[PDB]
Every structure is written in structure tokens, then in C-alpha cells.
């Protein structure tokens, strides 16, 4: 039938009949629709000559204080289709149909059909705009108080200060009011980290008035969420007032309203279908609270960026790099910014990097600022010079010294003699200036984590360089397999695997570097081995696939490890004896191997690629006859086949690498025992005691305990069994201690 040009406002002038509830649908539905709001859309050009638009609004709005007269206005409006050389009829020739639509009284809003309206048709384009670019009928074309306090005017002071970077984000925010659905995005995750300062980005657009054509009217107010007998009847009061005033928005500041003094206070007024504002909730509180309603989970749009990304933080950081510089009184060599984002990026597994890196602006800036806080030892030596006798200088006044005389003015002259030097070298020595990286990185995370080693130094031009080397220092051997890994998930790093996507097999007996270099492995990785978690795949069989996958058909025995790592922000996993099982289970252990995570039943989808899992085998004592010195390719290919006997390439094509044991010898026995000596060097020679290494006893007992069954691990205890008891010898000595050395 009709078009988009202001039949828009006749469909919603039929909503103006629903708005204004009148038994004659009046021209003030056409015009109090056509004037959508009391804003100056006065932009109708006829407030020049005779009749004010706002005067029409007031007097016809007192007349209320298609109605076939105005259904003939539909006709006379369609009569204007050929009168002014058009295709179609536009937006204000409704009013050029509005003979009847006048407030014709003593103050008549009688409407000029010609008078200077023809000069106003020399004004309006007319025959250029027939219709339809999509439809080109746009805008200017041819208690009310501290209960809702704001920051909008406070930003419009300029006192609130510009954060930067969220152009697309605040753009999204603009798009949310373009919904017909969900007028807030509940920013989830870590809100208010700067996401409150994203709202400062929004009021920042208000003070800019980059805030558009339309949205300059309504404004952000800050809610008062505090306590009073009843708290809430006042709030129900102020609801109808400012909601009736209706030219603002507010926040839920922190909490969705689930309280006792009540929860459903004006949550029914929300449920009245009204009231565009902003809520507040997090990731799992979207998942709890907002989803706990599932009408909250209906009504708002969940959006976040986190406690955020990289160059976002570079943006807002180098933008606020003047503001918080007016706080912390230092300013930046931006390599500190680089290394800061870089390192707390590498670190913080449970909290997030960047508002914690704003907190690094706090810690590091507070650190240089605390070589920069209080009165400035040699200036304090000058203060000792200020600090010999005023605090006892004087009393010769009290009685008859002929002596007041001397020592009085001796120390008058003598101090003031020795004084203004303090001013001179003090104002000189009141340090260097900008916030350098090196030590306001190194010193400060040394104030947090430490050692400018694995905990700080760690540029991976260092450890990726000496990587294979470094772990090969720990448990020697398998260096082929070592940089088969260090190579292998070297190219997990530099992004060349999937960002959510690694498994490594053992070939030997336990604790030969299985326990010990799976140990020393993760202890090299992030400096600490504690991440790594065990199930044998002799253990995960059928209903440890139940206690691996939660029940309801067969209990909450699901996950021997699930709820732990579910709570954890970081872990590493090692599993054992894989083709001790059959090709059937390798699909559920392959379900561990999936997803860029695992799907068990309990809690959360996250990354894989930050750390590693590891596999282990021991069965191939048969192919040790192959070792009894055939190659990597021979025996790895042999138990790559014998591997593949039970295995699945879905499952195996989630495993990275076959990892050998170069079974070990008595020599590697001797040398990991030599590492055990270097342990006691590393711990108990910290009393810095010298060491007799008697190779009689060493190769004696080493010769003894080279276990065919157990390998090396238990013997280590069986070393110390005597040996550290031998230390007790030494402990009960206190004599062959630091600097000296005995054994047999």
C-alpha cells in the first residue's frame, strides 16, 4: 500500500492514539507523532512567518486536554502528489493537508496554504526528493536529583578525563539502543575495570557531543545504591517522577536487585515494559544471576570485552598516559608499557592482565614514585649537620650566663654558617625522570615475582634459544625427543598450531625421567612443576570412564581430575600406559584430546594451548631387544607400528610425539645420581660444605641398585637412606662441615 516516509509516523500515530487514548483520533496523533518528542524537530520551517510549531503542540494538546476530517487530509495529501511535481507524498504535506488541523481560536494556529509557504517551497527541494533512497525522509531534510546523581555533566565539566580505544565498542553501545530488544549490553566478565571507564567513554562522547543528532537528549545518571527504615518506597516514588521526566538513563551500578529491603522493587517497573538503562553482572553471574531469572537472561544483551585486548590496552594506556601521570607524578619510557603488558600477559592465569597492568602502573609508578615520595643519606648527613644542638641549644637565657653569651651565638653563627648549603644541594638533589623499562620492569616484578630468571629474565630469545639445552641439563638423555618437543611445540608457539589445540609419549620404566623429567620438564616451563596431574590409562578403563565422565545414568564420580582443574587457572597433565588399554577407550581419552579442551560435564569451555599433556608407556620391553642399539627410526617406527596396533589416528592425530628413553643405562644412573649430588649441593650446600664423592661407594651402591624391575627412582631413596643419614654423622659432627669433606 503505502511508503516508509512518515506512514512510519502514521503507524506510530496509530500508536499515538494508543499513547494518548482519545475517542477521536486527532491531528495531534499525526502531529504529536510527527513531532515525536518536545525537541525542536521547530525544525519545521513554518516557525519563521506566522505560527510556531510549539504553539501548535500546546494548543492542540489543549484540544486533547482517522476522524474523517483528517481522513480527508489523507486525500488532500494525496491531492498534493501532482500539485507540486512529485512521484509520491512526503512527511509534512500531512500538515499541508492540515484546513482542519489548525488550533483556530483567538490565538489561531491557522496554517498558511500559500502566504509565504510558497517561498518555503522555494526553500524545500521538493521534486528532487520523490522518495526512496531506502526512504529519504529524515530529520532536517529539505525529584530529578542526586538519587540519580550523574557523571554526565561531570564528564561535561571535562573533570572526568578521556580514556580511549573503544570506538568499535562504544559503537556497539550505540547499536544497542538501536535494538528493539535488549537496551543494555550486560558487560560481563570483569566489568568496571575500565568498563565503567567505557561508560566514561560514553559520557566522553557526550561531552564531545559526538553523541549524535538524536541521543544528545537523554543522559547517563549514576544510581544511588545505599541504605535508609524502608529503603525502597522512596525508590518507587522517584521512579514515577524521573521516569515521568524521562530524559535520562541510569545504571545498575553493581548488583542486579536481589535484596530484602525487596528484590522486586521496580523490577516490576522494569517488567512494566519501560525504562531503558544499564545493568551489571559478570560471566558466571550472567550465567548465574541473569540466567537465574531467565527473564533477566531475556531482557538484556550480554556483551563484553574482558578486563581486556592488547593494543586496546596500548590505546587506553597511552591515552590515560597523561591523566594518571598527573597522579603518579612520573611519565613513561613506553618499553615499560611493552614489557608490562608482555609480562603480566605471560603471568596472570586467574585474574586478568590489563587492569592488573593498570595496577602495574600503580606498583611500578608507585615504585619510582617511591624513590620519589618523602624528604630526600648524604643529604641526611647534611640533616645531621642540621641535627647536632638546636634541640638542645638555648637555655643560657634562663639565668645568669655571661658565658647567654657565647655558645648561644656560637651555634647561631655556627648553624646559619652551616645551613643554606642544605637548601642548595637539596634543591639540586631533591633523580632521573621518565619511567624506564629495564628496572621499573625488572625491579618491580622483582617486587612481585622475582629474579631478573625463569620468573623474570625469560625473553625466549633466551629460553627458546637454550631450551633443549636447558631441559637437557635436568635429566640427561633423549635430546632427540627433547627438541622433538621443544621443536614440536616450539611451533605451537609463534602461533603455528591452532589457538585452541598437544601430547607426548614415554618409552621406559617409571621415574627415570618419567616422574623426574616430567617433573623437571614443567619445572622448567613456567619455573614450577606443580601443574601436572595424573591418571593411569590402566586406571581409566570402563567406570573410571564413569569417574572420568559424570553420570545420571551410570554418579558424580566423573572426573578424577575435573573439579580441580575446573577450579584451576593453570595445569599440565600426564597420563600413563595407554595401549595397556584397547582402541575403545582411546576415543574417551581422545575426548580429553579434543575441543581445544575436554568435554567432561562440569563447568566451562576454555583454551588448551597455554600448556601441555603427556603420555607414558612401559610395555615395550620386547622392543628393547631392538634397543639391545637400533635407531630412533627403527625402534620408534617399530613401536610406532606397535603403538598403532591398539591405537586410533583420530586419537593419535591428537597426540604429538613419541618420546623415548635413550630404558637407561648405569651411566645415566651415575649421572642422574650426579644430579642428586647436585641437588644436595643445590640445597644443603647453600651450608656451602665441600664434598667427598667416593666412587667406591658410589659405583658400588649404584652398581647394586640398578634395578631391572624398577629402574632408578626407588634407589634414590636408598641412596639417601644411608647418605643423608651419613649427613647426620656430619650433623652430629658439626666438624666435617662447611669447607671440609668426608665419606668412605
Author numbering: 5 to 69, 80 to 112, 116 to 159, 162 to 247, 255 to 287, 296 to 464, 466 to 536, 539 to 587, ...
Relevant lines from the article:
The ClpC-ClpP machinery acts in regulatory and general proteolysis, controlling multiple cellular pathways and differentiation processes and is crucial for bacterial stress resistance and virulence. ClpC activity crucially relies on cooperation with adaptor proteins including MecA, that target specific substrates while concurrently stimulating ClpC ATPase activity. Here, we report on an unexpected mode of AAA+ chaperone control involving transition between an inactive resting state and a functional hexamer as revealed by determining the cryoEM-structures of S. aureus ClpC in absence and presence of MecA.
Attempts of 3D classification and refinement using the existing ClpC-MecA structures failed to give a refined map, indicating that on its own, ClpC assumes a substantially different conformation. Indeed, reconstructions revealed that ClpC without MecA assembles into an oligomeric assembly made of two open spirals that interact via head-to-head contacts mainly mediated by the MDs. The AAA+ domains are staggered with a rise of ~20 Å per subunit. The MDs coiled-coils constitute the backbone of the spiral and mediate the spiral head-to-head contacts, which involve residues F436, R443 and D444 providing a structural rationale for the activated states of respective MD mutants. As MecA-binding sites in N- and M-domains are not accessible in the resting state, we suggest that ClpC subunit dissociation is prerequisite for MecA binding.
